[PDB]
Design a protein around this motif. Structure first.
Motif, PDB file in Angstrom:
ATOM      1  N   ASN A 170       0.839  -1.186   0.000  1.00  0.00           N
ATOM      2  CA  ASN A 170       0.000   0.000   0.000  1.00  0.00           C
ATOM      3  C   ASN A 170       0.879   1.243   0.000  1.00  0.00           C
ATOM      4  OD1 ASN A 170       0.937   0.399   2.607  1.00  0.00           O
ATOM      5  ND2 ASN A 170      -1.096   0.709   3.503  1.00  0.00           N
ATOM      6  N   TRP A 171       0.298   2.351  -0.461  1.00  0.00           N
ATOM      7  CA  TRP A 171       1.079   3.569  -0.645  1.00  0.00           C
ATOM      8  C   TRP A 171       1.530   4.154   0.685  1.00  0.00           C
ATOM      9  CZ3 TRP A 171       3.524   4.953  -4.732  1.00  0.00           C
ATOM     10  CH2 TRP A 171       3.065   4.552  -5.993  1.00  0.00           C
ATOM     11  N   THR A 172       0.704   4.034   1.725  1.00  0.00           N
ATOM     12  CA  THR A 172       1.121   4.518   3.037  1.00  0.00           C
ATOM     13  C   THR A 172       2.353   3.768   3.527  1.00  0.00           C
ATOM     14  OG1 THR A 172      -1.233   4.889   3.464  1.00  0.00           O
ATOM     15  CG2 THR A 172       0.288   5.137   5.312  1.00  0.00           C
ATOM     16  N   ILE A 208      16.998   3.376  -8.983  1.00  0.00           N
ATOM     17  CA  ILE A 208      16.981   1.920  -8.837  1.00  0.00           C
ATOM     18  C   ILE A 208      16.503   1.268 -10.129  1.00  0.00           C
ATOM     19  CG2 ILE A 208      16.045  -0.010  -7.519  1.00  0.00           C
ATOM     20  CD1 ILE A 208      17.920   1.710  -5.898  1.00  0.00           C
ATOM     21  N   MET A 209      15.367   1.739 -10.648  1.00  0.00           N
ATOM     22  CA  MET A 209      14.773   1.129 -11.834  1.00  0.00           C
ATOM     23  C   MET A 209      15.721   1.206 -13.021  1.00  0.00           C
ATOM     24  SD  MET A 209      11.911  -0.087 -10.892  1.00  0.00           S
ATOM     25  CE  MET A 209      12.791  -0.443  -9.376  1.00  0.00           C
ATOM     26  N   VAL A 210      16.245   2.405 -13.292  1.00  0.00           N
ATOM     27  CA  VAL A 210      17.110   2.594 -14.451  1.00  0.00           C
ATOM     28  C   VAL A 210      18.388   1.789 -14.300  1.00  0.00           C
ATOM     29  CG1 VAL A 210      18.440   4.285 -15.753  1.00  0.00           C
ATOM     30  CG2 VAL A 210      16.136   4.837 -14.991  1.00  0.00           C
ATOM     31  N   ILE A 238      -4.751  -1.110 -18.875  1.00  0.00           N
ATOM     32  CA  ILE A 238      -3.900  -1.178 -20.057  1.00  0.00           C
ATOM     33  C   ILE A 238      -2.438  -0.956 -19.684  1.00  0.00           C
ATOM     34  CG2 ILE A 238      -3.983   1.228 -20.811  1.00  0.00           C
ATOM     35  CD1 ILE A 238      -4.464  -1.844 -23.103  1.00  0.00           C
ATOM     36  N   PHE A 239      -2.166  -0.287 -18.563  1.00  0.00           N
ATOM     37  CA  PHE A 239      -0.790  -0.184 -18.089  1.00  0.00           C
ATOM     38  C   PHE A 239      -0.276  -1.538 -17.615  1.00  0.00           C
ATOM     39  CE2 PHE A 239       1.587  -0.102 -14.120  1.00  0.00           C
ATOM     40  CZ  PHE A 239       2.793   0.406 -14.553  1.00  0.00           C
ATOM     41  N   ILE A 240      -1.101  -2.276 -16.871  1.00  0.00           N
ATOM     42  CA  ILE A 240      -0.731  -3.638 -16.492  1.00  0.00           C
ATOM     43  C   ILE A 240      -0.481  -4.474 -17.742  1.00  0.00           C
ATOM     44  CG2 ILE A 240      -1.596  -5.748 -15.433  1.00  0.00           C
ATOM     45  CD1 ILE A 240      -2.977  -3.978 -13.323  1.00  0.00           C
TER      46      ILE A 240
HETATM   47  C1  LIG Z   1      -3.095   4.555 -13.884  1.00  0.00           C
HETATM   48  C2  LIG Z   1      -1.707   3.917 -14.025  1.00  0.00           C
HETATM   49  C3  LIG Z   1      -0.810   4.618 -15.049  1.00  0.00           C
HETATM   50  C4  LIG Z   1      -1.098   3.831 -12.612  1.00  0.00           C
HETATM   51  C5  LIG Z   1       0.252   3.059 -12.721  1.00  0.00           C
HETATM   52  C6  LIG Z   1       0.931   3.207 -11.353  1.00  0.00           C
HETATM   53  C7  LIG Z   1       2.183   2.256 -11.261  1.00  0.00           C
HETATM   54  C8  LIG Z   1       3.196   2.725 -12.313  1.00  0.00           C
HETATM   55  C9  LIG Z   1       2.720   2.371  -9.837  1.00  0.00           C
HETATM   56  C10 LIG Z   1       1.703   1.751  -8.804  1.00  0.00           C
HETATM   57  C11 LIG Z   1       2.558   1.075  -7.661  1.00  0.00           C
HETATM   58  C12 LIG Z   1       4.035   1.408  -8.041  1.00  0.00           C
HETATM   59  C13 LIG Z   1       5.097   0.470  -7.560  1.00  0.00           C
HETATM   60  C14 LIG Z   1       5.093   0.454  -6.030  1.00  0.00           C
HETATM   61  C15 LIG Z   1       6.317  -0.318  -5.514  1.00  0.00           C
HETATM   62  C16 LIG Z   1       7.390  -0.535  -6.252  1.00  0.00           C
HETATM   63  C17 LIG Z   1       8.539  -1.305  -5.645  1.00  0.00           C
HETATM   64  C18 LIG Z   1       9.885  -0.571  -5.760  1.00  0.00           C
HETATM   65  O1  LIG Z   1      10.915  -1.353  -5.193  1.00  0.00           O
HETATM   66  C19 LIG Z   1      10.127  -0.188  -7.195  1.00  0.00           C
HETATM   67  C20 LIG Z   1       8.985   0.587  -7.812  1.00  0.00           C
HETATM   68  C21 LIG Z   1       7.609  -0.064  -7.698  1.00  0.00           C
HETATM   69  C22 LIG Z   1       7.518  -1.283  -8.638  1.00  0.00           C
HETATM   70  C23 LIG Z   1       6.497   0.959  -8.038  1.00  0.00           C
HETATM   71  C24 LIG Z   1       6.526   1.425  -9.504  1.00  0.00           C
HETATM   72  C25 LIG Z   1       5.323   2.289  -9.907  1.00  0.00           C
HETATM   73  C26 LIG Z   1       4.027   1.524  -9.606  1.00  0.00           C
HETATM   74  C27 LIG Z   1       3.928   0.179 -10.274  1.00  0.00           C
END
Ligand SMILES: CC(C)CCC[C@@H](C)[C@H]1CC[C@H]2[C@@H]3CC=C4C[C@@H](O)CC[C@]4(C)[C@H]3CC[C@]12C
Ligand SMILES: CC(C)CCC[C@@H](C)[C@H]1CC[C@H]2[C@@H]3CC=C4C[C@@H](O)CC[C@]4(C)[C@H]3CC[C@]12C
Ligand SMILES: CC(C)CCC[C@@H](C)[C@H]1CC[C@H]2[C@@H]3CC=C4C[C@@H](O)CC[C@]4(C)[C@H]3CC[C@]12C
Ligand SMILES: CC(C)CCC[C@@H](C)[C@H]1CC[C@H]2[C@@H]3CC=C4C[C@@H](O)CC[C@]4(C)[C@H]3CC[C@]12C
Ligand SMILES: CC(C)CCC[C@@H](C)[C@H]1CC[C@H]2[C@@H]3CC=C4C[C@@H](O)CC[C@]4(C)[C@H]3CC[C@]12C
Ligand SMILES: CC(C)CCC[C@@H](C)[C@H]1CC[C@H]2[C@@H]3CC=C4C[C@@H](O)CC[C@]4(C)[C@H]3CC[C@]12C
Lengths: 207, 207, 207, 207, 207, 207
Positions: free
Chosen positions: D2-4, D33-35, F28-30
């Motif tokens: 969760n975001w919190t 981290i991602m890049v 669609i992002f998933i």
């Molecule tokens: C409406 C759509 C575009 C919303 C998409 C939101 C996505 C991009 C968000 C929601 C939750 C997010 C993730 C939350 C937790 C992590 C774990 C971390 O260790 C790396 C990033 C990562 C994987 C985030 C990447 C961005 C993420 C996947």
């Protein structure tokens, strides 16, 4: 994942443990974990096909690699890390077991005795950790005269008819990562001496 | 992840189990897991292409490797580890099942009988664990005369016209890891004998 | 991870299921999972480049491998395992769905009927599991005359001008792992017959 | 997930920390981290066999690669990232430890002192982070004169009899990823200066 | 992990959904996931180096492989699986969003309208799933005339001077896995037709 | 894992966000995530050794590959995906931070101001997402004239004495996956324009 849970996991519900270990030793141990895994994934890798000897004869290259590097740096650090961990894991098990025994007693002085024995266990565990660190540093010194890796070696052994000049793969980065790991181990050594002496001095202050 | 949960998982909600196993055997079993996985990831690896025989003929190298090392060290340890685990897993399943039966009875003496049968199950499980450990140690002795690996072998078999001198890849580190695993297995053996005899003596003390 | 959760996951909230399956079948199924994954990671591997045929002609080796081993042992066991699992998964889904329907009824005799139909579902699922096990054992017998692998074969097929003597990679360990998997499957077969007959006898005792 | 929880994990239960870091620095650190991971998985890879030198002599290619690229870009960024992380991890440990001490006091002014010391710890940690970033940028400048990679190099060293023209594998994409990582590090640098100065100015405003 | 949670995840808190999908379609979809991943890990693999063409010319083998197998079986099944999933994921998102809107209304007839629109959404989603399944089956028929793979092909294309007889790697097992996947897809097709018609008939019964 | 948690994670506790994004854009992002990872694991892979050029000279193949494909399709999509994500992650961080500030205020009008600033943040974030999508589409157009890959190319560059006809590995499937990813990006573009204009129109309706 939360910071309270991670901190408790690193500490181990040990009321006798001081701030020194709980914070600093946990942090630099996590640092050791990170540096160990990233480097192995990155630079050493298989660390055998990278080794190149100028000989067309099959098997001479492997024999020669084996002669010059009996035990790898990364495997030695990994073994050191596991062996260092086992004492702390043992102490954590001891405390978890003792609280369970106390609970079963509740379901169906002594408490002071429990406290004292746990204190002694913690002290001896830290001492063992220090000893393991020192032994592994000595093994490092024995195996490799210098921190920097050797680029050029001469290889005169069976089944290699002539001495072949033979080369190491990626020495410069292995040197850097070696320095990092060695510094981490040293920091642990000093921390452990300081922690033990602090516990003893505090006990003296109490009495 | 918390220490109470890990300790309970390693123990298995077995009120009859003594401190000996719960702490020490769990710790050294975790140590066995760690040493088994790290070493396989690290040194043995594929452990087939590393083996080099001086013959250009295709297939002679594989036949010869097969002759000299019928079963690998790491696969044997992994099989030993799984087979050792299965008894303890069985006992954990037995206790988890029995508590569920008790709960279903509550929803809709005997309790003493449950306790006794669980005790007997635990004792027999520990005995089976000891037997598996001993059998695997004997197999190790039979397969390999000595702890240290052999660097040089002579290979006179079909389809290899001449006996070829053939070499092992990384003997020195395999020796060290072999010693570590063997010592762990031995420690388990002694622990298991001690645990069983302790249970029997305590039962005698009770009566 | 806790033992109660693992036990419930293996069982599936099935009040009709007997102790036999719940404990023993779950344990030996977990054992099958472990032995299947470790061995595939370890010995069979890609299990194609290891196969060596003495021919310089490209493609003859692959054709010959395909002729002698139509379907691999490990893939066959994996398929068997998935196909065996699907019945039990189906029964677990049935019970989870039925309790949800009961809850929705509560929010807004029959209960006896639910119980009986669930019993019948469980019995038929166990029967299907037994049938799958037996069919896969028969396929094993048909594909390979003997448990031990063949080291030497003769290969006379297109595009191979002469019959080539061709060799298998690691027969001795494949034999051992084959024996282990076969014994596990057999144990499952007997367990399943015993479980079904026990359910029928208990039903007869009730009436 | 969760975001919190993610936000608290990134922040670290630090009441002194300002919005700047908590939001922006966490976001761009996650971006780093991602890049870092995607690019290493994707383009650099083993980054050794890709390097090609026109010489049939064995070992000249590896020596030459080592001369031109002492430390890889990706390993350097990974080391930078770990070393940057360690200060923040240390501060999180400090706060988690202090709250535990407060709880143990409750079970069996000072609070103001705790607050002040935590503030000082946070400021010094941010300063150390800034210093690490700057040092790593300087090392980048020293090691490589320009951001763009060199496609063609001349290689005149032992054991290579003639200078060999030698080529890099995938320069264009390495340039792009280098720019991305460098921009991220710079953004972190400015953010950290701004955060420290903001804290000091707010403290001045308070008094 | 518990069966209630897994069942709810597979279903999606959809009160309009019938038993048919909830149980059977979830089960066979999980089966599709398992068979898809295991087989790709196991048999197809890289599925390019395995393909062997008798030509020493570089590039002719890849061109010829590309001509005979434009799109792989496993990639096609994976794409089918993702595309099938997206409708169900969409419906789950719709219900999760609508309950959140209802909650926000509570914090600060219509309910009947919500129910009806959700019903229509579910029906259309199932129809789309059926259409995707049918389209992918048609593509399978078009790409490959027969279920069994072709072992021998003739390859007369640039830059291959002569037609080369060229061979496939592992046809027998690919045939078996193809049959399994095709049967799963067909079962899904019939299930989906049955589910839609059942919903319509139940709606007619209601009115 | 539950649908409410997944939906909240995708949304981000943003009360201003409309149904459009929350459901469709998340779905669609998933889908983009799934298609990106499966395809890279499957078809492109290392995507360098697959490229074949008819030249025996070492290094000419890599130079030529680099000339024709400066940046790969899959790396470009991955970079696009990360860069698209960062805005949404930033907004989620902003809301999580603001609620924490509100809680700390509670422990020890303005609320309307918080609401308005969050609305503005969301609108600007969506605009940035749209801009990133459009820029990446333009880069795709610039780098590759057509969606379909080129099978045959002519390679006249140093150190290749003659122009060599050189071939791509797996064009047909790369075309299909390219179309899928491009369509997903376009759908996102239209969704984002629609979402922004919907927010503006709703704001106008309010006033
Ligand atoms: C409406 C759509 C575009 C919303 C998409 C939101 C996505 C991009 C968000 C929601 C939750 C997010 C993730 C939350 C937790 C992590 C774990 C971390 O260790 C790396 C990033 C990562 C994987 C985030 C990447 C961005 C993420 C996947
Ligand atoms: C102050 C410092 C030295 C404390 C360090 C304690 C470390 C070594 C302890 C804390 C929690 C422990 C971990 C707890 C759980 C597991 C999972 C198990 O499947 C393997 C061991 C492993 C991974 C343990 C290894 C040791 C461990 C990481
Ligand atoms: C005192 C010592 C010997 C106790 C050791 C008990 C060990 C062997 C028990 C404790 C918990 C058990 C694990 C519980 C859960 C799983 C996950 C499952 O998918 C495979 C088996 C596996 C991994 C079990 C293997 C056996 C296990 C690790
Ligand atoms: C008595 C014995 C035979 C019971 C065995 C039941 C086993 C087969 C059941 C219990 C829980 C089930 C698992 C539950 C969750 C998942 C995750 C999913 O993503 C793939 C299937 C998988 C991995 C299931 C496979 C079947 C499974 C492992
Ligand atoms: C504002 C920014 C810079 C804050 C960044 C804080 C980051 C670096 C912190 C937050 C949570 C931390 C992680 C918490 C848990 C683990 C798991 C452990 O097994 C290895 C370290 C690792 C992965 C930590 C690394 C450092 C970490 C990722
Ligand atoms: C009746 C049948 C067809 C229902 C099948 C529903 C399946 C396809 C649904 C149920 C839960 C869903 C998963 C929920 C969470 C994740 C994690 C995310 O990071 C990628 C997608 C993924 C993996 C989803 C894919 C679709 C999924 C597996």
């Amino acid at each position: 994942m939360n910071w309270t849970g991670l901190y408790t996991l690193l500490s181990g519900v040990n009321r006798h443990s001081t701030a020194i270990g709980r914070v600093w030793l946990s942090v630099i141990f996590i640092f050791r974990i990170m540096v160990l895994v990233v480097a192995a994934e990155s630079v050493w890798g298989d660390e055998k096909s990278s080794f190149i000897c100028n000989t067309l004869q099959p098997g001479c290259n492997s024999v020669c690699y084996d002669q010059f590097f009996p035990i790898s740096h990364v495997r030695l650090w990994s073994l050191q890390l596991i062996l260092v961990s086992t004492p702390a894991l043992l102490v954590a098990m001891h405390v978890a077991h003792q609280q369970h025994i106390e609970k079963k007693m509740l379901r169906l002085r002594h408490k002071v005795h429990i406290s004292g024995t746990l204190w002694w266990t913690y002290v001896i565990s830290v001492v063992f950790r220090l000893l393991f660190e020192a032994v592994f540093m000595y093994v490092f010194y024995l195996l490799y005269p210098g921190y920097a890796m050797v680029r050029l070696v001469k290889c005169d052994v069976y089944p290699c008819p002539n001495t072949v000049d033979c080369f190491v793969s990626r020495p410069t980065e292995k040197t850097v990562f070696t320095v990092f790991m060695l510094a981490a181990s040293g920091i642990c050594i000093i921390l452990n001496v300081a922690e033990v002496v602090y516990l003893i001095i505090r006990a003296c202050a109490r009495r």
